[PDB]
Amino acid sequence: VKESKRQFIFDVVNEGGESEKMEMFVSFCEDTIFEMQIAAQISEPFWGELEVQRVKFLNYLSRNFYTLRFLALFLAFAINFILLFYKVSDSPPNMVYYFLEESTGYMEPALRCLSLLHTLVAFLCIIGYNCLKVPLVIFKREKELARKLEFDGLYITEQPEDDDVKGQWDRLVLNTPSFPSNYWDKFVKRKVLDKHGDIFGRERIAELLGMDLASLEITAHNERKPDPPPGLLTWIMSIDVKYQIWKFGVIFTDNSFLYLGWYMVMSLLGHYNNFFFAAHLLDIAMGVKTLRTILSSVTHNGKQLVMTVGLLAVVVYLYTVVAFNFFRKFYNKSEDEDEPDMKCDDMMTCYLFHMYVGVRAGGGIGDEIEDPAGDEYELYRVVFDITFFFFVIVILLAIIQGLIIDAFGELRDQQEQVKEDMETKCFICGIGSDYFDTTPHGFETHTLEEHNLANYMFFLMYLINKDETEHTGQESYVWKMYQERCWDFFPAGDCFRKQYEDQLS
Amino acid sequence: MVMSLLGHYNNFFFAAHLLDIAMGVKTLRTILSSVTHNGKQLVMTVGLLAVVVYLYTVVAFNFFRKFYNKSEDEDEPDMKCDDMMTCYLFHMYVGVRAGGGIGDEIEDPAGDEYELYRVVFDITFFFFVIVILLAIIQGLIIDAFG
Amino acid sequence: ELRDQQEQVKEDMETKCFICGIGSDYFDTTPHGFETHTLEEHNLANYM
Amino acid sequence: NFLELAESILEYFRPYLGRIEIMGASRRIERIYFEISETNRAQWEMPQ
Ligand SMILES: CCCCCCCC/C=C\CCCCCCCC(=O)OC[C@H](COP(=O)(O)OCC[N+](C)(C)C)OC(=O)CCCCCCC/C=C\CCCCCCCC
Ligand SMILES: CCCCCCCC/C=C\CCCCCCCC(=O)OC[C@H](COP(=O)(O)OCC[N+](C)(C)C)OC(=O)CCCCCCC/C=C\CCCCCCCC
Ligand SMILES: CCCCCCCC/C=C\CCCCCCCC(=O)OC[C@H](COP(=O)(O)OCC[N+](C)(C)C)OC(=O)CCCCCCC/C=C\CCCCCCCC
Ligand SMILES: CCCCCCCC/C=C\CCCCCCCC(=O)OC[C@H](COP(=O)(O)OCC[N+](C)(C)C)OC(=O)CCCCCCC/C=C\CCCCCCCC
Ligand SMILES: Nc1ncnc2c1ncn2[C@@H]1O[C@H](COP(=O)(O)OP(=O)(O)OP(=O)(O)O)[C@@H](O)[C@H]1O
Ligand SMILES: Nc1ncnc2c1ncn2[C@@H]1O[C@H](COP(=O)(O)OP(=O)(O)OP(=O)(O)O)[C@@H](O)[C@H]1O
Ligand SMILES: CCC(C)(C)C(=O)O[C@H]1C[C@@H](C)C=C2C=C[C@H](C)[C@H](CC[C@@H]3C[C@@H](O)CC(=O)O3)[C@H]21
Ligand SMILES: CCC(C)(C)C(=O)O[C@H]1C[C@@H](C)C=C2C=C[C@H](C)[C@H](CC[C@@H]3C[C@@H](O)CC(=O)O3)[C@H]21
Ligand SMILES: CCC(C)(C)C(=O)O[C@H]1C[C@@H](C)C=C2C=C[C@H](C)[C@H](CC[C@@H]3C[C@@H](O)CC(=O)O3)[C@H]21
Ligand SMILES: Cn1c(=O)c2c(ncn2C)n(C)c1=O
Ligand SMILES: [Ca+2]
Ligand SMILES: [Zn+2]
Ligand SMILES: [Zn+2]
Q: What is d(CA B125, CA B121) in angstroms, rounded to the nearest whole number?
A: 6
Degrees, nearest 5: CA angle A421-A423-A427: 65
Q: What number of CA atoms fall less than 13 Å from residue A419's CA on the CB side?
A: 6
Degrees, nearest 5: CA angle A249-A250-A255: 110
Write out chain B residues lying below 8 Å of A352, CB-based.
119
Q: Indicate which technique resolved this structure.
A: cryo-EM
Q: What is d(CA A201, CA A187) in angstroms, rounded to the nearest whole number?
A: 19
In sequence order, what E strands does A84-212 have?
Answer: 86-89, 97-100
Q: What is d(CA A416, CA A409) in angstroms, rounded to the nearest whole number?
A: 11
Q: What is d(CA A183, CA A191) in angstroms, rounded to the nearest whole number?
A: 15
Beta-carbon neighbour count of residue A104 at 10 Å? 8
CB A481 within 8 Å of CB A471: no
Write out chain C residues lying below 8 Å of D18, CB-based.
46
Q: Among B54, B55, B56, B81, name the best residue to mutate to test ligand 1's pocket (greatest count of ligand atoms within 8 A of Cβ).
A: B55
Contact C28 A494 (CB under 8 A): no
**What DSSP character marks residue A424?**
H
Would you say the C-alpha torsion A356, A361, A364, A370 has a positive or negative sign?
A: negative
Does A279 sit in the ligand 1 pocket, CB within 6 Å?
yes
- Return the amino acid letter for A307: M
The residue whose C-alpha atom lies closest to atom 1 belonging to ligand 4 is B52
SS (H, E, C) A276-294: HHHHHHHHHHHHCHHHHHH
| Contact residues of ligand 8, CB 6 A cut-off | A 377, 379-380, 383
Contact B122 A360 (CB under 8 A): yes
Q: Of B139, B77, C24, which is closest to residue A407 (Cα–Cα)?
A: B139
Q: What is d(CA B136, CA A43) in angstroms, rounded to the nearest whole number?
A: 42
Q: After which residues, if any, is chain B broken (C to N > 2.5 Å)?
A: none
Contact A404 B135 (CB under 8 A): yes
- Return the amino acid letter for A380: Y
Q: Residue-wise over A221-245: b if at least 16 C-beta within 10 A, else e?
A: eeeeeeeeeeeeeeeeeeeeebbee
Which residues face A425 on adjacent strands? A432
Backbone angles phi, psi at A332, to 5 degrees: -95, 120
Which H or E element spans position B24?
helix B20-24
Q: Of A377, A321, A325, which is closest to residue A354 (Cα–Cα)?
A: A321
Does C24 sit in the ligand 6 pocket, CB within 6 Å?
no
Closest-approach residue (CA) in chain A for C28: A493
| Contact residues of ligand 5, CB 6 A cut-off | A 2, 422-423, 426-428, 447, 451-453
Report how far apart, in Å, the C-alpha atoms of A150 and of each of A30, A188, A191, A421 are.
18, 7, 7, 35
For chain A, the chains sharing at least 3 beta-carbon pairs closer than 8 angstroms are: B, C
Q: What is d(CA A430, CA A153) in angstroms, rounded to the nearest whole number?
A: 33
Q: What is d(CA A167, CA A367) in angstroms, rounded to the nearest whole number?
A: 57
Q: Residue-wise over D10-44: b if at least 16 C-beta within 10 A, else e?
A: eeeeeeeebebbeeeeeeeeeeeeeebeeeeeeee
CB-based burial label for A147 (10 Å; 0-12, 13-18, 19+): middle
How many residues appear in chain B?
146
Which H or E element spans position A37?
helix A21-42
Q: What is d(CA A21, CA A18) in angstroms, rounded to the nearest whole number?
A: 5
Contact A492 C31 (CB under 8 A): yes
Does B120 sit in the ligand 9 pocket, CB within 6 Å?
yes
Beta-carbon neighbour count of residue A167 at 10 Å? 17
**Dihedral, A377, A379, A385, A389 alpha carbons, nearest 10:** -170
Q: What is d(CA A493, CA D43) in angstroms, rounded to the nearest whole number?
A: 37
Backbone angles phi, psi at D33, to 5 degrees: -115, 135
Beta-carbon neighbour count of residue A406 at 10 Å? 18
Does C28 sit in the ligand 6 pocket, CB within 6 Å?
no
Distance A6 CA to ligand 4 centre (A): 42
Write out chain D residues lying below 8 Å of C40, CB-based.
19
SS (H, E, C) B20-89: HHHHHCHHHHHHHHHHHHCHHHHHHHHHHHHHHHHHHHHHHHHHCHHHCECCCCCCCCCECCCEHHHHHH
Q: Under 8 Å CB-to-CB from A9, ≥6 apart: which residues?
A: A418, A422, A427
CB A114 within 8 Å of CB A74: no
Q: What is d(CA A64, CA A5) in angstroms, rounded to the nearest whole number?
A: 21
Interhelix angle A107-132/A21-42, rounded to 10 degrees, is: 120
In sequence order, what E strands does A141-204 have?
Answer: none
Query: DSSP 3-state assignment of A474?
Result: helix
CB-based burial label for A368 (10 Å; 0-12, 13-18, 19+): middle
CB-based burial label for B56 (10 Å; 0-12, 13-18, 19+): buried
Q: State the best of B41, B44, B134 to mutate against chain A, taking most chain A CBs within 10 Å.
A: B44
CB-based burial label for A380 (10 Å; 0-12, 13-18, 19+): middle
Q: Under 8 Å CB-to-CB from B31, ≥6 apart: which residues?
A: none
Secondary structure (DSSP) of A110-129: HHHHHHHHHHHHHHHHHHHH
Distance B124 CA to ligand 9 centre (A): 14
Q: What number of CA atoms fall less than 13 Å from residue A388's CA on the CB side?
A: 30
Beta-carbon neighbour count of residue A50 at 10 Å? 10
Beta-carbon neighbour count of residue B110 at 10 Å? 15
Please state the atom number of ligand 7 nearest to the C-alpha of residue A255.
28
H-assigned helices in A279-396: 283-287, 289-300, 302-326, 347-353, 378-388
Secondary structure (DSSP) of D1-48: -HHHHTHHHHHHHGGGEEEEEEE-TTSSEEEEEEEPPHHHHHHHHS--
The residue whose C-alpha atom lies closest to atom 34 belonging to ligand 2 is A325
From chain C residues 1-48, the ones with a CB under 8 A of any chain A CB are: 3, 25, 28-35
Smallest CA–CA distance, residue C47 to chain A, in Å, is 24
Q: What is d(CA A239, CA B77) in angstroms, rounded to the nearest whole number?
A: 67
Query: DSSP 3-state assignment of A88?
Result: strand
**Dihedral, A440, A442, A445, A448 alpha carbons, nearest 10:** -140
The residue whose C-alpha atom lies closest to atom 15 belonging to ligand 3 is B6
CB A19 within 8 Å of CB C35: yes
Beta-carbon neighbour count of residue A479 at 10 Å? 16
| Contact residues of ligand 7, CB 6 A cut-off | A 255, 258-259, 262-263, 266, 279-280, 282-283
Contact C42 D20 (CB under 8 A): yes
Ramachandran region, residue B108 (left: φ > 0; alpha: ψ -120 to 50; beta: rest): beta
Find the ligand nearest to A494 CA: 12
CB A23 within 8 Å of CB C32: no
Q: What is d(CA A434, CA A452) in angstroms, rounded to the nearest whole number?
A: 18
Q: What is d(CA B42, CA B36) in angstroms, rounded to the nearest whole number?
A: 9
Which H or E element spans position A177?
none
Would you say the C-alpha torsion A163, A164, A169, A175 has a positive or negative sign?
A: negative
Q: What is d(CA A116, CA D20) in angstroms, rounded to the nearest whole number?
A: 73
Q: What is d(CA A326, CA A369) in angstroms, rounded to the nearest whole number?
A: 13
Q: What is d(CA C42, CA C48) in angstroms, rounded to the nearest whole number?
A: 11
Report how far apart, in Å, the C-alpha atoms of A486 and of each of A31, A66, A490 are.
18, 38, 9
Q: What is d(CA A100, CA A109) in angstroms, rounded to the nearest whole number?
A: 11
Q: Does D33 touch chain C (CB under 8 A)?
A: no
Strands D17-23 and D29-35: antiparallel
Radius of gyration of chain A (CA): 33
Q: What is d(CA A119, CA A117) in angstroms, rounded to the nearest whole number?
A: 5
Q: What is d(CA A337, CA A330) in angstroms, rounded to the nearest whole number?
A: 14
Q: What is d(CA A433, CA A426) in angstroms, rounded to the nearest whole number?
A: 7
Query: DSSP 3-state assignment of B136?
Result: helix
Find the ligand nearest to A355 CA: 9
Beta-carbon neighbour count of residue B50 at 10 Å? 14
From chain A residues 332-361, the ones with a CB under 8 A of any chain B CB are: 341, 352, 355-356, 359-361
Q: What is d(CA A494, CA A497) in angstroms, rounded to the nearest whole number?
A: 8
CB B64 within 8 Å of CB B34: no
From chain A residues 405-464, the ones with a CB under 8 A of any chain C CB are: 406, 410, 430, 432
Q: What is d(CA A257, CA A130) in angstroms, rounded to the nearest whole number?
A: 8
Q: What is d(CA A304, CA A406) in angstroms, rounded to the nearest whole number?
A: 12
- Return the amino acid letter for B22: A
Contact D44 C45 (CB under 8 A): yes
Q: Under 8 Å CB-to-CB from D18, ≥6 apart: which residues?
A: C46, D33, D34, D35, D36
From chain B residues 48-107, the ones with a CB under 8 A of any chain A CB are: 48, 51, 54-55, 58, 61-62, 65, 82-85, 88, 99-101, 103-104
Q: Residue-wise over B7-38: b if at least 16 C-beta within 10 A, else e?
A: eeeeeeeeeeeeeeeeeeeeeeeeeeeeeeeb
Return the percent helix, strand and coil in chain A, to nearest 5. Answer: 70, 0, 25
Q: What is d(CA A336, CA A267) in angstroms, rounded to the nearest whole number?
A: 50
CB B87 within 8 Å of CB B144: no
In sequence order, what E strands does D1-48 have?
Answer: 17-23, 29-35
Q: What is d(CA A260, CA A267) in angstroms, rounded to the nearest whole number?
A: 11
